[PDB]
Amino acid sequence: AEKTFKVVSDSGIHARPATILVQTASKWNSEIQLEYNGKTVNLKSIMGVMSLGIPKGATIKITAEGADAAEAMAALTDTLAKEGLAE
Amino acid sequence: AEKTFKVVSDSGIHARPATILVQTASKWNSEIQLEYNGKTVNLKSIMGVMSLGIPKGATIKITAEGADAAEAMAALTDTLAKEGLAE
């Protein structure tokens, strides 16, 4: 059995609701998997669920405040581009 | 300082690249935050980053295989709708 869901929560799914989901899955003996962001995890393992990461197409906002803020932003920009992650 | 990035990696950003990012941030004394999915975390804390969760608009695919698979899918469907998470 396989079913596709669209996430509708403004908050998305964080640790608290992901914990409730994970514990619903754990009530059952079948193998339950959740597939997202190119990864398939065990729905009974919250460490699995919390390891899906940030998806392609995400907009993220980084802020740096402090004495080496310019050096910080430049390093972080360079890492995101070097590693082919974000731009 | 604030900058917005779009994530371009097919894989998105998982634990391995998020670990490299997190360690780039840690090299610096400024306060570095990452804002995503309605949450602002410390970019120096990988537990923070791995706690951003699944975003609004995500398509997730759940599979259940086993002796109580029908009971499993129905429980999981009911939880996702009850909690106003996914449909």
**Looking at B4, B14, B41, B77, which residue is catalytic?**
B14
Determination technique used: X-ray
Interface of B with A in 2-21 (CB under 8 A): 2-15, 17-18, 20-21
Cβ-contact B30, A64 below 8 angstroms:
yes
Helix boundaries (H) for chain A: 15-26, 46-49, 69-82
Q: How far apart are CA B15 and CA A81, in angstroms?
A: 17
- Domain B14-87 fold is Histidine-containing Protein; Chain: A; (3.30.1340)
Cβ-contact B13, A49 below 8 angstroms:
no
Looking from the CA of A87 toward its CB, the CA atoms found within 13 Å total: 6
Contact A80 B5 (CB under 8 A): yes
Residue A7 pairs in a beta bridge with B86
What totals of helices (H) and strands (E) does chain A contain, helices first?
3, 4
Q: Which helix or strand (DSSP H or E) is residue B70 part of? A: helix B69-82
Contact A86 B6 (CB under 8 A): yes
A41: Cβ–Cβ under 8 A, 6 or more apart, which residues? A33, A34, A35, A48, A49, A51, A52
Q: How far apart are CA A68 and CA A62, in angstroms?
A: 15
Domain boundaries, chain B: 14-87
Q: How far apart are CA B54 and CA B46, in angstroms?
A: 16
C-alpha distances (whole Å) from A73 to each of A7, B3, B23 are 32, 8, 13
**Nearest-Cα residue of chain B relative to residue A47:** B50
In this structure, the number of other CB atoms found within 10 A of the CB of residue B16 comes to 11
Resolution of the solved structure (Å): 2.0
Interface of B with A in 21-60 (CB under 8 A): 21, 24-25, 27-39, 43, 50-60
| Side chain identity at residue A15, one-letter code | A
